[PDB]
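Ticket #4471: complex job returned nothing on first submit. Input attached below:
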Amino acid sequence: SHVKDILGLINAFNEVKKITVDGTTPITVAHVAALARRHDVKVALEAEQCRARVETCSSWVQRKAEDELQESLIRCLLAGVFTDELPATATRSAMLLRLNSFTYGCSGIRWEVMEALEKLLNSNVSPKVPLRGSVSDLIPLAYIAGLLIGKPSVIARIGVPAPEALSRVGLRPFKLQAKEGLALVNGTSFATAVASTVMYDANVLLLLVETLCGMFCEVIFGREEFAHPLIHKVKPHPGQIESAELLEWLLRSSPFQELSREYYSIDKKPKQDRYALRSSPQWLAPLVQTIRDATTTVETEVNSANDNPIIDHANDRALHGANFQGSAVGFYMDYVRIAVAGLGKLLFAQFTELMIEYYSNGLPGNLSLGPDLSVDYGLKGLDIAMAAYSSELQYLANPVTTHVHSAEQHNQDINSLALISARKTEEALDILKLMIASHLTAMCQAVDLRQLEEALVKVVENVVSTLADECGLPNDTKARLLYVAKAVPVYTYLESPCDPTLPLLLGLKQSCFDTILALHETDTLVDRLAEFEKRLSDRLENEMTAVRVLYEKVRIQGSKFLPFYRFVREELDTGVMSARREQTPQEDVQKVFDAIADGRITVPLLHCLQGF
Amino acid sequence: SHVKDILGLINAFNEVKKITVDGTTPITVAHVAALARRHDVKVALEAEQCRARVETCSSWVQRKAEDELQESLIRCLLAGVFTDELPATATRSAMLLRLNSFTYGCSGIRWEVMEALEKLLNSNVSPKVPLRGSVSDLIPLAYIAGLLIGKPSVIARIGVPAPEALSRVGLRPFKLQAKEGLALVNGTSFATAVASTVMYDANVLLLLVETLCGMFCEVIFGREEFAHPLIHKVKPHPGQIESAELLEWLLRSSPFQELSREYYSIDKKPKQDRYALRSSPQWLAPLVQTIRDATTTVETEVNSANDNPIIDHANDRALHGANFQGSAVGFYMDYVRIAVAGLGKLLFAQFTELMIEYYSNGLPGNLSLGPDLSVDYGLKGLDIAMAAYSSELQYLANPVTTHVHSAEQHNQDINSLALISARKTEEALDILKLMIASHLTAMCQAVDLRQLEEALVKVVENVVSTLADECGLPNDTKARLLYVAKAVPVYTYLESPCDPTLPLLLGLKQSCFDTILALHETDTLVDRLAEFEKRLSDRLENEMTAVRVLYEKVRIQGSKFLPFYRFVREELDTGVMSARREQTPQEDVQKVFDAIADGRITVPLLHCLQGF
Amino acid sequence: SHVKDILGLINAFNEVKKITVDGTTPITVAHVAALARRHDVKVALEAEQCRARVETCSSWVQLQESLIRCLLAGVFTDELPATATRSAMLLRLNSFTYGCSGIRWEVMEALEKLLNSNVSPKVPLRGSVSDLIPLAYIAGLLIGKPSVIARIGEVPAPEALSRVGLRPFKLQAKEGLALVNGTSFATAVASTVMYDANVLLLLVETLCGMFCEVIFGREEFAHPLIHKVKPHPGQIESAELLEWLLRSSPFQELSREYYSIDKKPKQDRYALRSSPQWLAPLVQTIRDATTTVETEVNSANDNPIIDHANDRALHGANFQGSAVGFYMDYVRIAVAGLGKLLFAQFTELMIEYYSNGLPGNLSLGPDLSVDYGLKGLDIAMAAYSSELQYLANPVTTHVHSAEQHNQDINSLALISARKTEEALDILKLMIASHLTAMCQAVDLRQLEEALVKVVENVVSTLADECGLPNDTKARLLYVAKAVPVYTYLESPCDPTLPLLLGLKQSCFDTILALHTDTLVDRLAEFEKRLSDRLENEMTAVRVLYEKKGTADNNDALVRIQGSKFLPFYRFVREELDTGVMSARREQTPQEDVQKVFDAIADGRITVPLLHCLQGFL
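Support reply: We reran it on our side without changes. The output follows.
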């Protein structure tokens, strides 16, 4: 299962200490992301393994020479403009990728240059690089080359001008030998760097979305049979089988699935769930497959000699090709952006169902607790933003690769645009993070609302029961009134429980008339019904208030989504949203988003999945 | 002419001191941009003019009341997430626009709230606002409302939490009266703010592009008849007539147009210019019209009561409508983005012609001066970036308004997305600025190359002439050799003037054979030709070098584009690009871009156009 | 107002007999569409004044076939239809009338003759970046190329010239170029596109009024002060038309009564309330693109431009279709916005939570288990909108550097125009469905009124019969008035459905108020006699309505007769011969919507549209 593969990525991202660069050990997107994001992670360039072929190649090039031009290529390519930059994370990833390309011994670069790139990486030195200019990555790579040769105009980050930056790590400016200038700039390092972190995040966020479909089922009162393995066996898209497999496991023995069954046994209400849940495995299938296949394509590029000419020193020749062409990455970035847009549309439609009382199977509109709804609009602001998020996301998922210009004196009459496409997919993932943060926040709210709903319904039954006794009502009357306390969705009347126009009293009044026709000492029975109604408005609301305030001051405890609710509630320190909670939606969702952005969300994710 | 209208905008942007906010005087996009960008520009809210209807409306609302709910609306809408923000410029513009909307006396807001917004603006106080969440601008406007009521979680810029921010300007937190909460958040202020500065820049950059088509004609050796008024009279799109009118005026009496005529009189070479020039007025026509019409639509929105309900106090009623719907702005932002993309495609194709010797009518590939081309790649890096720029730009110009989601419990089943579309058009203008900066830099390079070409050709004629005399060559021989010194494009042989395989010597050798067959004392004539060839390689290159180095250490002086070349060369302190110029392309284009971004480019623009 | 202009366009389309081609009288998009679609419309090339400036140009000018040959390069894959090709012939002919092309007058007469005799080459769909290749086929026809196939309402080109009394031309200096060097095809398709865009725009605006009537909207959204204070011209004018349309509506009156019972949403949803603001840019885009396309129609789009008066040929690029290309991109975005509006409106109408009393999917039932109403049309509406939004991506952003990098910018106008045309085809589909749905809604609203009346009569007469007190009669009558009939029509006496539920609440409340054994006996007798009478009398009034196809005194009140939208309902029901949709109606949704679509497609919808708008100023 892809699920195990993503878990493997997450573990590797967390646990890696040293990234081995040896020309044989594959570098994964988790490795690229770990170096980018965790500064204790060091590069380990292994001489024993690859130095020999690098030096042979290097010397072969020197051989052909013997049998300034380089600097003037670098100068020509320091043509970017600071509008906004490629971030240090992307730049350092590019430096790792270029260094890796060099390990295959096809480039002719000196080993000493490779050791300098290793040293720059482990000392957190990187040039400031303009965001735009590559059609895929001459111009952005020139800034790394410029650093290496100590161009004064190239500004470098440490944790100053390139020369000073080199001083501080005990390097001196390099004097480029034949081919070294071209070898430094002639790669796909930046497109593939951004694509690496993009693919890492896409994998994590994919698994996160799949998992939260289970949590949506629990809070929306879904029917878990949508995840039954036979359904998928018979339409066997691998992503469909594997996502359904996860969901079945997540929802097996769910205490909320028990409440759902109970709910559909009273007043049998829609027979099937709407598509945002029932159709999630079919929807996810292509998305899973796109993200997984694009991860293999990006890793292949990470682990390639993307350079030209390719030196086959073994056979005394330079081969003229186009390994600098980032098309494999460019096209897959376009496909992943479309898939991420499909991930957002799924979240938007789920979130939409949750906000609407007609579709939420008992929940209050906007997930407002109230009880006073005139001063509690609940998650309406988040509902609006979700549309805003999805709308921009669908727009971002148009392709970039359809906009190929004939470039560089028509020499580059096809070009990948991979870096541009990678940036748009990156930006699309930013929006997906936003959407995931809001969706999880909404579901924790919905968890609280379901547990509160269960306790309130108990209070209403207890109040109706005991008052029926006090008022001396027939058993026939009691049973009819209790069935109503059971059947009526509490959120439809919580605002004013004894309002005679709201659904509780309406049901009670229907039953009181029905009890009157069935038992027809008539006038005393009417007196006792009247006294019941009177004591109900003495007592009911007060006791609903007390249980709610007590809640504000156990079913999720049996749920596999416990780690998520616990993380959001206890660890991030939040509570049910209401008029009595000072914190704005922003403040609560900000915390969830920050934990998604920085990887802390992986802890409750792996807890949730322990044993799958 | 739209040209005068844009000049009017530029003048107003430069000259305004006080923005009058009085409910009658229109606010233009130049006013919105001036307040945004120049902090000496103050807001002037005129009581005399509009306070009376504001207070009537205010009191009318109080009347209906009398006959917290507001805060809870604000709290619900503080639902943005800091991923990246709306910049202070956009936020302050939004504050101006909301304040303006209130001047029409339809909103019910208190005058005191309006004075607070005036005070906040003139003291440079503004809330930090999340970039995303609006489908057009509840959520972003909530942050202004939050500031006004002193919400602690709302952070404010001064030049701290909202309460402290209010202290510092002598305001106290407001206690919202009936409708005030809704009135604060129920507008199009942010979409229209971004759209205002977008439209201001689009106008300036449009005129800038039209004008630089004239400069492209001059350096590419174009035929100015493409701008002849009869051509356009007969296909009378207003933008076609007006752009052509500008170009005809720019190129009338051009000293470069004289050189162009001379150029086509030797070896009559293409009969017509390629489309990037000859078809520019037809291309510009719809672009001019889109930008001008979108400017009227955005200004109409600036000067509107975008709120709901609309209070008709005169007739004792509240009217229920949707003036909060930013559709007029949203759709026009989509059209302007497409037009900006057409502006970039025009620049890309012009820049492409300039870089390619087959299409540049005598200029060196990549505009390299050399003479040694193996260490001078010229503007190749900029040529590559231009493709990168155009490619992303064409991608940005897909519509946003086609991505309307059914939002907010399906209440908002149509929504404008104007703010999102405005941001994409904004980002598209960023790329267009980049492209304009590179194009102007390329043309100053091309100016130098044309003036150098003219001086070098003179040196070659003088050297050929005087050596012919020294060597005692027949007049027949001299005239044939001089015609060759005249006809042969100097940049085709500048690298090695006496290389016998390069076009100078090839032409000379052809003529020497032809003179031999025509005059056929044979052996002495051959001796003198041989001595000519020998003295040519003693002397020619040295004297070409001397005139070039002298140049590096008058036709643009008669050109209407003089202010541009002078600005770029003298004022920004640059020179012909070569191996002998330390500064990278980045450093030179950065200066041009910065002057475009900050409005300094308007000075040479208005100089160029004085008297049109 | 733009409404007057579109009316003016519809009238010229219907009324024109002769299109004057003279180099001074503008040709409008309605002329272009008329020539295309109505074969009795002839071309009149006017010799006086026009012929003189043409011949001067012709003689001042005083190898060609090798250009034509090179350009006969398209592939039959599909075709530009005859309508676009004849339109293109008209536009090229018109270009020549300004006396800048150098073409011979006799060529112009031949084109006039070919147009009036309905002769046109079959032209492949694709190949223009804008219109050398497609125009080549018209040139090919004129010069008698055997390989060019011509229609005459099919023979090789020289056979076709023969039949109308022409001989193949021998092209003179420049004539080859003047024939292929124009924007005639992009502008032809753009013209019929713009004509249809105007008509469909006005049709959608007008139908927002009908939507208001059947959804129970609040016409206040159209109040002129709302729009005066946000004065986008298209916002002001659409609201102005809507205010007039909705003034004195008997459905708006029924609506006001509806919101007085249980005062239910205070404002309408955006699909109605925000329609003028939404329509604003759409109106302005369609109107401005019309001006632009007309300017192109009435241009010399050709190169070189001959300035004989000054004795020179001018070298420019009037062959560049950019003004048309960009505006086609914009119009397509605007047509996408009109479809989104229709989709949103159609969506509200199908959903009982948003339709203010209407049944889900506009199902009549009563038996909903065999009547899914308009659900198939509701599904199709999503399909239509979805493809439409996709079609509205721009074409002008896909400019290739073409023809040995000579055409390094090119407009793609014909490709864009074709995409906008395809978008309009979908909009017609959406309009046909929406209007069909609103006629169903009209019927459901009229039936709703008559059913409520029957329930009221039954409750009332049974109250008296069973001897119920006044407090009781009044309470029960109120429930008959307030409970939406469609929520219980499936089984009116079902104790778990909303009628009996409200009746039972009322009975308990009357018993509590009058506090007996006898009262209970009478209420029980009331309830059981309700089962005797209610259903059969609801059925009878409904069956009577369905059986109706000239009205009796027995027939239910038909509010539509006092509505401005009568012309639309009457056209769809009487003239197109349809009826309320239900399980008892044999016809499929297809068959009904087809008739509406065909009438939109062929211009017949303009009759009820002009009736409806009669007297607007």
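Strands of chain A lie at 18-21, 42-45, 125-127, 156-158, 310-312, 317-319. Closing as resolved unless it happens again.
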